[PDB]
Each structure stands twice: as structure tokens, then as C-alpha cells.
Amino acid sequence: DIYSRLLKDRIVLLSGEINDSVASSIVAQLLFLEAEDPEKDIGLYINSPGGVITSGLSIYDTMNFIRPDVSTICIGQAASMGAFLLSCGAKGKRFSLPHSRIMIHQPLGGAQGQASDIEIISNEILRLKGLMNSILAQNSGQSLEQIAKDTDRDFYMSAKEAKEYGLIDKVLQ
Template sequence: MRWNWLLRALTLLLFLEAEDPHKDIYLYINSPGGSVSDGLGIYDTMNHIRPDVCTICYGFAASMGAFLLGAGTKGKRSSLPSSRIMIHQPSGGAQGQAVDIEIQAKEILYTKNRINQRMADYTGQSLLRIEQDTERDFYMSAEEVVAYGLIDQVINPWELRKAELSTLQTASELVTAS
């Protein structure tokens, strides 16, 4: 089931690029997180395709959801005002022989370091700060996430609505005047 979802998400990103490689792709995120390997597949695809990927959080973006929110195109990462965003280190479990558990522990530490470095790159925060903040669940408001560098702006739906109405009124005036 999970594989089908990932395959659809990746296929959709590639399809939208093929449709128009110059048109922005909007990725709406309301997610408690999910598989790190799936998320990294989406992250790599977002960075592989030509269109800008605009990420918008509505509600909640945690864990891999927060990572993907920040991985959007700089200047095009946003959130609705009441959203909450949470970052933390990846988690996992291992069982079996001691040697196998050690192998899994090394792999999760490797993945943790990769994710932290990427997050430091796109937020502008130091790697040390990212490591400290992701040691445990770290919750932020939409405004705090802008200051942190994970997103670029908080979208105020009421101001957007006013702008839309203003545009409609201007268009209406042009039609009436002609």
C-alpha cells in the first residue's frame, strides 16, 4: 500500500514536469510524517525536476512532512497562520542479532546526519543548531518557522481573499469601461 502511494507521488511530480517544465508545482502538506526513505525519494525528485516546487503547510507538518516543507523552492515555501511544524531526528527500530542491530544503528545515524545537513543547508541554520533542535520533538508556530528559515512566508488567507476580490473588481471596472 505504502509503495503505491510513493509511486503515485513520484509519478505525479514527473508527470507535472512533463506537462509544463516551466510551471510551478504546488505541494500541499498536512502530515504527521512518515517513512524516511519514502520522504527522501520525494525530496530527491523535487530537486531533480525543473519546475519550482512551492510547498504550503496547512494544519500540521511534522517529521518528514516538515523536512519536505522546507525542501521546497526558496522564496516559495509557506504556511497558513495557524499551522504547527515539528522537527525531530529520525526514529527506527531494530531486532535480531547484536551485529545486525549495530548495522541498523549505524544506518539510522548516517541518515540522521544526511537529513540534518540538508536541513542546515536550506534553513541557513548551523549544523550544530539543527542537531540540537532535532534531538527531541521541536514544535514551532508558522511565524517561528519563518524566523528559523524553514519557510519564507506565512500566508494570510484573508489578505489573499482581499487581493483576489480587488483583482476581480479591477477586472469588472475594465469590462464596464469598455
């Protein structure tokens, strides 16, 4: 398994839509490495359009739970939770190839049922909105005010624009 083999070099590939099954796998790996050499570095390669908010968070929090440094690399794209996760790499170890697109937005959801329940989901997602649009600031150097304004709608950026934005550290040319 080419992934099994690459994982041997402490490399992890997050590819495509994020959800529990995939997010679990990432975590399973991250943990595995930490339980191999809790000292070294980890290479998280990200090419994702996003996905389940809580699924990505598990990945985010784990990237810190473990001891090893988690360096993120954007190849292809990092959209939504993919960008979020991307800006969660170890400060200084956050990169992107030259032609990757980085995009940031607000949470996406749905609610259905009695008014009471729609209010519960609405408040729950608005809550996740705030929680993430503050980490983005605390990860970019941008204020929550500016991070509130740019993510209102899809905010597309090129690698170079994301470095200058604070989502990444270096655009490996």
C-alpha cells in the same frame, strides 16, 4: 476526481502518513506535471505527520530531479518528514497558512537480531540522521550544531516561528 481536477491546475496534495504507496503517488504526479509543462510552477500542499524516511527522500530528490519549481505550502501541519519535505521547497516559494504547526525531530527506527545486525541498522539510521540534520541546516540558515540540538526531541513551532527559523519563506496571512 477532485484531485485529478486540481492536479490540472498543477496542484499536489500530500496528506497524512508518508510511505512508499503515497510517496510513489506524489512522485508519479510531480513527474506528470514536469511532463506537461516543464516550465511552470508546482504547488505541493503538505499536511503530514511524517513517515518512512526513504519514502520522503524519494519525494525530496524528485522535487529537484524534475525541472519545474516546487513550491511547498503547509496547511494543518508538517511534522518530521513533513517538515523536512516542507523545507525542501524551492527557496522563496516555501509557505504556510497562519495556524499550521511545524515540527522537526530525529529519525525513528527499530532493529532486531544479532548484535552485528543491530549495529548495521543503528549505523544506517544514524547515517540518515546526519544526512538530514545537515540538509535542514542547508535549508534553514541554521548551523548543523543548532539543528542537532533542536531536533534531539520533538521541536514544535508555529508558522510564524518556522519562518523565523528558516523552514519556510512566508506565512500567507
